Protein backbone atom coordinates (compact mmCIF):
# COMPACT_ATOMS: atom_id res chain seq x y z
CA UNK A 1 0.00 0.00 0.00
CA UNK A 2 1.18 3.63 -0.29
CA UNK A 3 2.23 3.88 3.36
CA UNK A 4 4.42 0.78 3.09
CA UNK A 5 6.02 2.16 -0.07
CA UNK A 6 6.71 5.37 1.86
CA UNK A 7 8.25 3.35 4.70
CA UNK A 8 10.49 1.46 2.28
CA UNK A 9 11.53 4.67 0.53
CA UNK A 10 12.47 6.25 3.86
CA UNK A 11 13.84 2.93 5.20
CA UNK A 12 12.06 3.48 8.51
CA UNK A 13 8.95 2.11 10.19
CA UNK A 14 8.12 5.62 11.49
CA UNK A 15 6.94 8.30 9.06
CA UNK A 16 6.70 11.99 9.93
CA UNK A 17 4.05 14.38 8.65
CA UNK A 18 4.73 15.43 5.08
CA UNK A 19 4.46 14.58 1.41
CA UNK A 20 6.99 12.09 0.04
CA UNK A 21 7.65 11.49 -3.64
CA UNK A 22 7.33 7.74 -3.33
CA UNK A 23 7.40 6.17 -6.78
CA UNK A 24 6.30 6.53 -10.39
CA UNK A 25 3.06 5.44 -12.02
CA UNK A 26 2.89 4.15 -15.58
CA UNK A 27 -0.16 2.90 -17.44
CA UNK A 28 0.57 -0.42 -18.99
CA UNK A 29 0.03 -1.57 -22.58
CA UNK A 30 -3.06 -3.70 -23.08
CA UNK A 31 -2.21 -5.42 -26.39
CA UNK A 32 0.72 -5.99 -28.73
CA UNK A 33 0.32 -5.28 -32.45
CA UNK A 34 2.69 -6.04 -35.34
CA UNK A 35 2.38 -4.41 -38.76
CA UNK A 36 4.25 -6.06 -41.65
CA UNK A 37 3.87 -5.44 -45.40
CA UNK A 38 2.06 -7.46 -48.08
CA UNK A 39 5.12 -9.58 -48.71
CA UNK A 40 4.58 -13.35 -48.73
CA UNK A 41 6.94 -14.73 -51.40
CA UNK A 42 9.88 -16.42 -49.69
CA UNK A 43 13.38 -15.14 -50.33
CA UNK A 44 15.50 -17.15 -52.81
CA UNK A 45 17.90 -18.46 -50.18
CA UNK A 46 17.78 -21.97 -51.66
CA UNK A 47 19.04 -20.69 -55.02
CA UNK A 48 22.05 -18.99 -53.43
CA UNK A 49 22.88 -21.81 -51.01
CA UNK A 50 22.13 -24.71 -53.38
CA UNK A 51 23.58 -23.25 -56.58
CA UNK A 52 25.07 -25.76 -59.00
CA UNK A 53 28.27 -23.74 -59.47
CA UNK A 54 29.96 -21.36 -57.04
CA UNK A 55 32.24 -18.53 -58.11
CA UNK A 56 35.89 -18.33 -57.10
CA UNK A 57 36.87 -16.60 -53.87
CA UNK A 58 38.78 -13.84 -55.67
CA UNK A 59 35.66 -13.38 -57.85
CA UNK A 60 33.10 -13.88 -55.08
CA UNK A 61 29.52 -14.03 -56.32
CA UNK A 62 27.31 -11.17 -55.11
CA UNK A 63 23.55 -11.77 -54.97
CA UNK A 64 20.87 -9.23 -54.11
CA UNK A 65 18.00 -10.33 -51.84
CA UNK A 66 15.18 -7.80 -51.49
CA UNK A 67 11.39 -7.54 -51.58
CA UNK A 68 10.79 -10.94 -49.98
CA UNK A 69 10.11 -12.47 -46.58
CA UNK A 70 13.36 -13.84 -45.15
CA UNK A 71 12.45 -17.13 -43.47
CA UNK A 72 15.75 -18.36 -42.04
CA UNK A 73 14.32 -21.75 -41.01
CA UNK A 74 15.11 -22.94 -44.55
CA UNK A 75 18.81 -22.32 -43.89
CA UNK A 76 18.80 -24.99 -41.17
CA UNK A 77 17.51 -27.65 -43.59
CA UNK A 78 20.28 -28.01 -46.19
CA UNK A 79 23.29 -27.03 -44.09
CA UNK A 80 25.44 -29.03 -41.64
CA UNK A 81 26.45 -25.58 -40.29
CA UNK A 82 30.19 -25.96 -39.82
CA UNK A 83 30.27 -22.22 -39.03
CA UNK A 84 27.27 -19.98 -38.27
CA UNK A 85 28.96 -16.85 -36.94
CA UNK A 86 26.54 -13.91 -36.81
CA UNK A 87 28.34 -10.62 -36.13
CA UNK A 88 26.34 -7.65 -34.87
CA UNK A 89 23.02 -9.56 -34.82
CA UNK A 90 21.80 -12.40 -32.65
CA UNK A 91 21.12 -15.34 -35.02
CA UNK A 92 18.17 -16.53 -32.92
CA UNK A 93 16.55 -13.11 -33.48
CA UNK A 94 17.03 -13.24 -37.27
CA UNK A 95 13.34 -14.08 -37.75
CA UNK A 96 12.21 -10.96 -35.87
CA UNK A 97 13.96 -8.07 -37.66
CA UNK A 98 13.43 -6.14 -40.87
CA UNK A 99 16.54 -5.45 -42.95
CA UNK A 100 16.79 -2.77 -45.63
CA UNK A 101 18.58 -5.20 -47.96
CA UNK A 102 20.30 -8.57 -47.96
CA UNK A 103 23.59 -9.17 -49.76
CA UNK A 104 24.72 -12.77 -50.27
CA UNK A 105 28.45 -13.08 -50.98
CA UNK A 106 28.96 -16.72 -51.96
CA UNK A 107 32.38 -18.24 -52.61
CA UNK A 108 34.48 -21.36 -52.05
CA UNK A 109 37.63 -21.46 -49.90
CA UNK A 110 39.74 -24.01 -48.06
CA UNK A 111 38.64 -25.53 -44.78
CA UNK A 112 41.37 -23.86 -42.73
CA UNK A 113 40.64 -20.47 -44.36
CA UNK A 114 37.15 -20.20 -42.82
CA UNK A 115 38.47 -18.29 -39.79
CA UNK A 116 39.94 -15.67 -42.14
CA UNK A 117 36.40 -14.68 -43.22
CA UNK A 118 35.75 -12.22 -40.38
CA UNK A 119 36.29 -8.50 -39.71
CA UNK A 120 39.80 -7.60 -38.62
CA UNK A 121 41.28 -10.89 -39.82
CA UNK A 122 44.61 -11.28 -41.60
CA UNK A 123 45.75 -13.78 -44.19
CA UNK A 124 45.98 -14.47 -47.89
CA UNK A 125 42.22 -14.78 -48.40
CA UNK A 126 41.38 -11.94 -46.01
CA UNK A 127 43.83 -9.46 -47.53
CA UNK A 128 43.87 -10.42 -51.23
CA UNK A 129 40.57 -12.25 -51.86
CA UNK A 130 37.73 -11.07 -49.60
CA UNK A 131 37.90 -8.49 -46.81
CA UNK A 132 35.00 -7.70 -44.47
CA UNK A 133 34.45 -4.15 -43.18
CA UNK A 134 35.41 -3.27 -39.62
CA UNK A 135 31.79 -2.39 -38.75
CA UNK A 136 30.31 -5.36 -40.64
CA UNK A 137 26.85 -6.44 -39.49
CA UNK A 138 25.33 -9.68 -40.70
CA UNK A 139 26.22 -13.37 -40.61
CA UNK A 140 28.76 -15.78 -42.09
CA UNK A 141 27.78 -19.38 -42.88
CA UNK A 142 30.45 -21.92 -43.85
CA UNK A 143 29.77 -25.55 -44.73
CA UNK A 144 31.78 -28.35 -46.31
CA UNK A 145 31.24 -28.96 -50.03
CA UNK A 146 33.72 -31.76 -50.72
CA UNK A 147 31.10 -33.99 -52.35
CA UNK A 148 30.30 -31.32 -54.97
CA UNK A 149 33.48 -29.23 -55.40
CA UNK A 150 36.11 -31.98 -55.70
CA UNK A 151 37.34 -34.09 -58.60
CA UNK A 152 39.41 -37.27 -58.72
CA UNK A 153 41.86 -35.69 -61.18
CA UNK A 154 41.72 -32.38 -59.30
CA UNK A 155 39.20 -29.52 -59.44
CA UNK A 156 41.20 -26.62 -60.90
CA UNK A 157 38.14 -24.47 -61.69
CA UNK A 158 38.55 -22.70 -58.32
CA UNK A 159 41.28 -20.06 -58.03
CA UNK A 160 42.44 -17.77 -55.23
CA UNK A 161 44.49 -14.58 -55.29
CA UNK A 162 47.78 -15.23 -53.48
CA UNK A 163 49.78 -12.10 -54.37
CA UNK A 164 48.69 -8.47 -54.70
CA UNK A 165 50.30 -5.05 -54.47
CA UNK A 166 47.96 -3.87 -51.70
CA UNK A 167 45.49 -5.49 -49.33
CA UNK A 168 41.90 -5.59 -50.55
CA UNK A 169 39.54 -2.94 -49.23
CA UNK A 170 36.20 -4.00 -47.71
CA UNK A 171 33.64 -5.03 -50.33
CA UNK A 172 36.28 -4.83 -53.07
CA UNK A 173 36.59 -7.49 -55.78
CA UNK A 174 39.81 -7.96 -57.76
CA UNK A 175 39.69 -9.90 -61.04
CA UNK A 176 42.78 -8.48 -62.75
CA UNK A 177 45.16 -11.08 -64.20
CA UNK A 178 48.22 -8.80 -64.23
CA UNK A 179 51.36 -10.65 -63.18
CA UNK A 180 52.50 -9.64 -59.70
CA UNK A 181 55.74 -7.65 -59.69
CA UNK A 182 58.20 -7.76 -56.77
CA UNK A 183 60.47 -4.73 -56.87
CA UNK A 184 60.87 -2.11 -59.60
CA UNK A 185 61.74 -4.26 -62.63
CA UNK A 186 58.73 -4.48 -64.98
CA UNK A 187 57.30 -7.95 -65.63
CA UNK A 188 56.70 -9.13 -69.20
CA UNK A 189 56.00 -12.77 -68.34
CA UNK A 190 56.62 -15.61 -65.93
CA UNK A 191 60.16 -15.60 -64.58
CA UNK A 192 62.32 -13.67 -62.13
CA UNK A 193 60.30 -11.55 -59.68
CA UNK A 194 57.12 -12.35 -61.65
CA UNK A 195 54.37 -14.60 -60.27
CA UNK A 196 50.77 -15.18 -61.29
CA UNK A 197 48.44 -13.69 -58.64
CA UNK A 198 45.81 -16.40 -59.24
CA UNK A 199 46.59 -19.92 -58.03
CA UNK A 200 44.31 -22.88 -58.70
CA UNK A 201 42.88 -24.65 -55.66
CA UNK A 202 43.06 -28.16 -57.11
CA UNK A 203 40.47 -29.57 -54.72
CA UNK A 204 40.60 -33.36 -54.38
CA UNK A 205 38.45 -35.73 -52.29
CA UNK A 206 41.58 -37.51 -51.03
CA UNK A 207 42.75 -34.30 -49.33
CA UNK A 208 42.26 -33.67 -45.64
CA UNK A 209 39.29 -31.98 -44.02
CA UNK A 210 41.27 -28.77 -43.46
CA UNK A 211 42.04 -28.71 -47.19
CA UNK A 212 38.59 -29.82 -48.37
CA UNK A 213 36.57 -27.19 -50.27
CA UNK A 214 34.15 -25.19 -48.13
CA UNK A 215 31.29 -23.04 -49.39
CA UNK A 216 31.02 -19.76 -47.48
CA UNK A 217 28.11 -17.33 -47.78
CA UNK A 218 28.30 -13.92 -46.10
CA UNK A 219 24.89 -12.36 -45.45
CA UNK A 220 25.36 -8.60 -45.17
CA UNK A 221 22.50 -6.60 -43.65
CA UNK A 222 21.75 -2.88 -43.35
CA UNK A 223 19.53 -2.54 -40.27
CA UNK A 224 17.65 0.68 -41.02
CA UNK A 225 14.04 1.20 -40.00
CA UNK A 226 13.16 3.71 -42.74
CA UNK A 227 13.24 1.50 -45.89
CA UNK A 228 11.99 -1.67 -44.14
CA UNK A 229 11.68 -3.98 -47.18
CA UNK A 230 12.78 -7.49 -46.13
CA UNK A 231 11.64 -8.81 -42.76
CA UNK A 232 11.20 -12.25 -41.28
CA UNK A 233 7.98 -14.28 -41.11
CA UNK A 234 5.77 -12.58 -38.52
CA UNK A 235 2.00 -12.62 -38.92
CA UNK A 236 0.86 -9.00 -38.75
CA UNK A 237 -2.12 -8.35 -36.48
CA UNK A 238 -4.89 -5.77 -36.49
CA UNK A 239 -4.24 -2.12 -35.60
CA UNK A 240 -5.79 -0.52 -32.51
CA UNK A 241 -5.99 3.24 -31.92
CA UNK A 242 -6.39 5.33 -28.75
CA UNK A 243 -5.13 2.42 -26.64
CA UNK A 244 -1.68 2.16 -25.08
CA UNK A 245 -0.13 -0.81 -26.88
CA UNK A 246 3.21 -2.36 -27.77
CA UNK A 247 3.54 -1.62 -31.48
CA UNK A 248 6.01 -3.19 -33.92
CA UNK A 249 6.10 -1.28 -37.22
CA UNK A 250 8.39 -3.21 -39.59
CA UNK A 251 10.90 -3.90 -36.83
CA UNK A 252 10.50 -0.55 -35.05
CA UNK A 253 9.42 -1.53 -31.54
CA UNK A 254 7.76 0.86 -29.13
CA UNK A 255 4.99 1.49 -26.63
CA UNK A 256 2.28 4.11 -26.80
CA UNK A 257 -1.10 5.17 -28.11
CA UNK A 258 -1.45 5.54 -31.88
CA UNK A 259 -3.92 8.17 -33.04
CA UNK A 260 -5.04 9.73 -36.30
CA UNK A 261 -2.60 12.42 -37.40
CA UNK A 262 -3.06 15.60 -39.41
CA UNK A 263 0.64 15.53 -40.32
CA UNK A 264 1.09 15.30 -44.09
CA UNK A 265 4.02 13.05 -44.95
CA UNK A 266 5.60 13.56 -48.35
CA UNK A 267 5.40 10.29 -50.34
CA UNK A 268 9.05 9.44 -49.66
CA UNK A 269 8.83 10.16 -45.91
CA UNK A 270 8.22 7.08 -43.77
CA UNK A 271 8.20 8.46 -40.21
CA UNK A 272 8.50 11.72 -38.30
CA UNK A 273 10.83 12.80 -35.51
CA UNK A 274 10.27 15.51 -32.93
CA UNK A 275 12.67 18.40 -32.39
CA UNK A 276 14.80 16.32 -30.00
CA UNK A 277 14.91 13.33 -32.38
CA UNK A 278 12.08 11.35 -30.77
CA UNK A 279 9.74 9.45 -33.06
CA UNK A 280 6.46 11.39 -33.16
CA UNK A 281 4.59 9.87 -36.12
CA UNK A 282 4.79 6.68 -38.16
CA UNK A 283 3.41 5.28 -41.42
CA UNK A 284 1.30 2.15 -41.61
CA UNK A 285 2.91 -0.43 -43.93
CA UNK A 286 -0.55 -1.63 -45.03
CA UNK A 287 -3.00 1.28 -44.96
CA UNK A 288 -0.35 3.98 -45.58
CA UNK A 289 -1.78 5.86 -42.60
CA UNK A 290 -0.02 8.60 -40.62
CA UNK A 291 -0.28 7.63 -36.94
CA UNK A 292 0.81 9.96 -34.16
CA UNK A 293 2.60 8.07 -31.39
CA UNK A 294 2.15 9.33 -27.84
CA UNK A 295 3.84 7.52 -24.94
CA UNK A 296 1.59 5.86 -22.40
CA UNK A 297 0.67 8.10 -19.48
CA UNK A 298 3.21 8.21 -16.68
CA UNK A 299 4.28 10.45 -13.84
CA UNK A 300 5.30 10.67 -10.23
CA UNK A 301 3.43 9.33 -7.21
CA UNK A 302 3.61 11.20 -3.89
CA UNK A 303 2.20 10.00 -0.57
CA UNK A 304 0.73 12.48 1.91
CA UNK A 305 0.82 11.17 5.47
CA UNK A 306 -0.26 12.99 8.65
CA UNK A 307 2.54 11.16 10.47
CA UNK A 308 2.55 7.45 11.23
CA UNK A 309 1.92 8.00 14.94
CA UNK A 310 -1.04 10.31 14.37
CA UNK A 311 -2.74 8.03 11.84
CA UNK A 312 -2.11 5.29 9.29
CA UNK A 313 -4.27 6.95 6.62
CA UNK A 314 -2.60 8.36 3.52
CA UNK A 315 -3.50 10.37 0.44
CA UNK A 316 -1.93 9.82 -2.97
CA UNK A 317 -1.05 12.43 -5.59
CA UNK A 318 -0.54 11.24 -9.15
CA UNK A 319 1.47 14.19 -10.44
CA UNK A 320 0.59 15.91 -13.70
CA UNK A 321 -2.23 13.63 -14.84
CA UNK A 322 -5.98 14.03 -15.20
CA UNK A 323 -8.18 12.18 -12.74
CA UNK A 324 -10.12 10.70 -15.66
CA UNK A 325 -7.09 8.96 -17.16
CA UNK A 326 -6.15 7.63 -13.72
CA UNK A 327 -9.68 6.34 -13.13
CA UNK A 328 -9.68 4.65 -16.55
CA UNK A 329 -6.32 3.07 -15.72
CA UNK A 330 -7.69 1.62 -12.46
CA UNK A 331 -10.84 0.41 -14.21
CA UNK A 332 -8.61 -1.49 -16.67
CA UNK A 333 -5.90 -2.33 -14.07
CA UNK A 334 -3.25 -0.68 -16.24
CA UNK A 335 -1.53 1.44 -13.58
CA UNK A 336 1.93 0.30 -12.49
CA UNK A 337 1.84 0.80 -8.69
CA UNK A 338 -0.93 -1.70 -8.07
CA UNK A 339 -1.85 -0.73 -4.48
CA UNK A 340 -4.97 1.17 -5.59
CA UNK A 341 -6.37 3.52 -2.95
CA UNK A 342 -10.09 3.07 -2.31
CA UNK A 343 -12.15 5.74 -4.07
CA UNK A 344 -15.51 6.93 -2.73
CA UNK A 345 -16.37 9.52 -5.38
CA UNK A 346 -15.60 12.39 -3.02
CA UNK A 347 -12.08 11.02 -2.49
CA UNK A 348 -10.92 12.17 -5.94
CA UNK A 349 -9.97 15.82 -6.47
CA UNK A 350 -8.37 17.46 -9.50
CA UNK A 351 -5.48 19.78 -8.69
CA UNK A 352 -3.15 21.53 -11.08
CA UNK A 353 -0.44 19.45 -9.39
CA UNK A 354 -2.15 16.21 -10.44
CA UNK A 355 -4.91 13.91 -9.24
CA UNK A 356 -5.42 13.65 -5.48
CA UNK A 357 -7.07 10.52 -4.07
CA UNK A 358 -7.84 9.90 -0.41
CA UNK A 359 -8.33 13.51 0.70
CA UNK A 360 -11.61 15.43 0.92
CA UNK A 361 -11.59 18.93 -0.57
CA UNK A 362 -13.24 21.29 1.91
CA UNK A 363 -14.28 24.78 0.84
CA UNK A 364 -12.62 26.55 3.79
CA UNK A 365 -9.11 28.02 3.79
CA UNK A 366 -6.50 27.29 6.45
CA UNK A 367 -2.80 27.84 6.92
CA UNK A 368 -0.86 25.34 4.83
CA UNK A 369 0.03 22.13 6.66
CA UNK A 370 1.30 19.70 4.00
CA UNK A 371 2.03 21.51 0.71
CA UNK A 372 0.50 19.68 -2.23
CA UNK A 373 1.02 22.39 -4.83
CA UNK A 374 -0.70 25.00 -7.01
CA UNK A 375 -2.19 26.60 -3.90
CA UNK A 376 -3.56 23.31 -2.53
CA UNK A 377 -2.54 21.90 0.86
CA UNK A 378 -3.69 18.94 2.96
CA UNK A 379 -4.13 18.40 6.68
CA UNK A 380 -5.47 15.83 9.13
CA UNK A 381 -8.61 17.47 10.50
CA UNK A 382 -12.08 16.60 11.73
CA UNK B 1 12.42 31.32 -7.96
CA UNK B 2 13.06 28.95 -10.84
CA UNK B 3 11.27 26.00 -12.39
CA UNK B 4 11.02 22.90 -10.21
CA UNK B 5 11.87 19.77 -12.17
CA UNK B 6 11.61 16.08 -11.36
CA UNK B 7 13.57 13.39 -13.18
CA UNK B 8 12.93 9.64 -13.16
CA UNK B 9 16.17 7.70 -13.60
CA UNK B 10 14.51 4.48 -14.66
CA UNK B 11 12.44 6.23 -17.31
CA UNK B 12 15.21 8.57 -18.50
CA UNK B 13 18.00 5.97 -18.62
CA UNK B 14 16.31 2.59 -19.09
CA UNK B 15 12.77 3.56 -20.06
CA UNK B 16 10.42 0.60 -19.49
CA UNK B 17 13.30 -1.83 -20.02
CA UNK B 18 13.74 -4.54 -17.39
CA UNK B 19 17.20 -5.66 -18.50
CA UNK B 20 18.52 -2.10 -18.41
CA UNK B 21 16.93 -1.46 -15.01
CA UNK B 22 18.52 -4.61 -13.59
CA UNK B 23 21.87 -3.48 -14.96
CA UNK B 24 21.30 0.00 -13.51
CA UNK B 25 20.76 -1.44 -10.04
CA UNK B 26 24.50 -2.26 -10.13
CA UNK B 27 25.47 1.43 -9.92
CA UNK B 28 24.19 1.86 -6.38
CA UNK B 29 22.28 4.89 -5.11
CA UNK B 30 23.22 7.45 -7.76
CA UNK B 31 19.53 8.04 -8.51
CA UNK B 32 18.52 8.32 -4.87
CA UNK B 33 21.08 11.13 -4.74
CA UNK B 34 19.83 12.77 -7.94
CA UNK B 35 16.21 12.63 -6.78
CA UNK B 36 17.14 13.97 -3.34
CA UNK B 37 19.06 16.89 -4.86
CA UNK B 38 16.20 17.79 -7.19
CA UNK B 39 13.65 17.59 -4.37
CA UNK B 40 15.82 19.88 -2.27
CA UNK B 41 16.02 22.35 -5.15
CA UNK B 42 12.23 22.36 -5.57
CA UNK B 43 11.50 22.81 -1.86
CA UNK B 44 14.08 25.61 -1.86
CA UNK B 45 12.27 27.32 -4.74
CA UNK B 46 9.04 27.33 -2.75
CA UNK B 47 10.97 28.62 0.27
CA UNK B 48 12.44 31.44 -1.85
CA UNK B 49 9.01 32.60 -2.94
Amino acid sequence: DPLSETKCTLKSFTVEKGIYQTSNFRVQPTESIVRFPNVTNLCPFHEVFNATTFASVYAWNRTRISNCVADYSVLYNFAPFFAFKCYGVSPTKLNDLCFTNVYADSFVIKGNEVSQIAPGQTGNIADYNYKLPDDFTGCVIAWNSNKLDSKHSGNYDYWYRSLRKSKLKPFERDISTEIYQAGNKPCKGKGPNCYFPLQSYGFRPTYGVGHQPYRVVVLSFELLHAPATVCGPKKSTNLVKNKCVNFNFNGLTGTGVLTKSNKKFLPFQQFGRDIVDTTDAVRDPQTLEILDITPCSFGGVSVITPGTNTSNQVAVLYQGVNCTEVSVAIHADQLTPTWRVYSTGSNVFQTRAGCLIGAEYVNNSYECDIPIGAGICASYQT
Amino acid sequence: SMTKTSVDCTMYICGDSTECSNLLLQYGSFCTQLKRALTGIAVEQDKNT
Partner: peptide, 29 residues
Protein backbone atom coordinates in the same frame (compact mmCIF):
# COMPACT_ATOMS: atom_id res chain seq x y z
CA UNK C 1 6.30 34.19 -21.07
CA UNK C 2 7.20 30.70 -19.86
CA UNK C 3 6.92 20.20 -29.04
CA UNK C 4 9.80 20.73 -26.61
CA UNK C 5 7.63 20.61 -23.48
CA UNK C 6 5.77 17.46 -24.52
CA UNK C 7 9.00 15.75 -25.55
CA UNK C 8 10.58 16.60 -22.19
CA UNK C 9 7.50 15.27 -20.40
CA UNK C 10 7.75 12.10 -22.51
CA UNK C 11 11.01 10.79 -20.95
CA UNK C 12 10.80 11.08 -17.16
CA UNK C 13 11.33 14.88 -17.05
CA UNK C 14 8.38 16.60 -15.38
CA UNK C 15 7.83 20.14 -14.09
CA UNK C 16 6.26 20.66 -10.67
CA UNK C 17 3.83 23.57 -10.17
CA UNK C 18 4.82 26.18 -7.58
CA UNK C 19 3.04 26.11 -4.24
CA UNK C 20 1.86 29.73 -4.50
CA UNK C 21 -0.15 30.49 -7.61
CA UNK C 22 0.24 33.78 -9.45
CA UNK C 23 -3.02 34.90 -7.85
CA UNK C 24 -1.57 34.41 -4.35
CA UNK C 25 1.66 36.22 -5.27
CA UNK C 26 -0.47 39.06 -6.62
CA UNK C 27 -2.50 39.03 -3.39
CA UNK C 28 0.68 39.28 -1.32
CA UNK C 29 2.03 42.13 -3.43
Amino acid sequence: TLDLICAQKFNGLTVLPPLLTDEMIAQYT
